[PDB]
């Protein structure tokens, strides 16, 4: 029920959906490198108690 | 919740008040009470008379978006348009009733 496993499973149905076009097998296909890449990080204002703010 | 996954749905809408289907204007005809008025009894008084009230922002309807036309607060919620005849007739004091000269 994790989120990380549902995000990658969104790829492993799209990637192999594109892999089968490249000729790549649908069956014998492996995951060689599955790496996370630090990406965009918004800055949200948070309002802590007693007049202190700390940016989420 | 017969959902198996709760959400903005499968939250059983009225797990009580099983006596549904009230024909107000039909029933209002038996009481002889101005069908337009009776139906107003059964929605928050903000929605019909000229009263101070709190509206949700989606309820307000958005400007013409690239995805959707200008959806005015009325054409999506017809039975919430305030009826200012029914307001004035009931709630405000007419010049007539105090005309002295």
């Amino acid at each position: 029920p994790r989120k990380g496993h549902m995000a990658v499973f969104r790829a492993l149905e799209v990637a192999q959906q594109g892999a089968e076009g490249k000729g790549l097998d649908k069956e014998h296909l492996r995951i060689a490198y599955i790496t996370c890449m630090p990406g965009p990080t918004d800055k949200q204002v948070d309002i802590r108690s007693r007049g202190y703010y700390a940016w989420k | 919740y017969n959902s198996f996954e709760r959400g903005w749905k499968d939250k059983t809408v009225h797990p009580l008040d099983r006596r549904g289907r009230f024909n107000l204007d039909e029933a209002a005809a038996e009481l002889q009470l101005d069908e337009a008025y009776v139906a107003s009894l059964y929605k928050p008084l903000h929605y019909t008379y000229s009263m101070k009230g709190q509206r949700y922002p989606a309820e307000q309807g958005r400007t013409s978006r690239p995805g959707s036309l200008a959806a005015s607060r009325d054409r999506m919620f017809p039975l919430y348009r305030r009826n200012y005849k029914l307001n004035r007739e009931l709630r405000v004091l007419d010049h007539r009733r105090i005309s002295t000269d």
Partner: protein
Amino acid sequence: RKALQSYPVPPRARNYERRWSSSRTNPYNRMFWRTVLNEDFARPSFWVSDFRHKYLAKHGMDYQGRVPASPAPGMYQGFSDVHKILANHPKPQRESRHLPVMPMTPRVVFEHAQEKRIDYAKKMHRDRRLVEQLRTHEFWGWYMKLQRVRGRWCKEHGVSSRGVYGPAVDAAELWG
């Protein structure tokens, strides 16, 4: 804080003070016993308590009668906000004989705007039951159709609706 002179009628509840006194409600029923019991408490309201000083001078007596209320037409004509140099009565009239008419001060009109919004409220409740006296009134009338159609169906299908046993456990009129 929204000076009381702004409200159409001075406010009903009047908050005060008193760090060492915590109670919202003004103690009425004490402001009432005084005033009803003691005549002097409330200023005479000039007219009804003038008209002496004008009978005594012109008649040589105490009036010794109930003074008319509703000050005579023509009295307090220069005054503008009488409301105190009177009871809360209206400014009496011109010095005329035309039928009495309320000089529609901003105050009188507001009272009209209450006695219409009192009739408004008592009317939105009076008929929220009048239709609640149909919904539940007709829901029962319909529910008894249900127990009738259930009453008819539960005889041909023979479901006694009284447990797994036969009526021989009922006829004992025990628990069993």
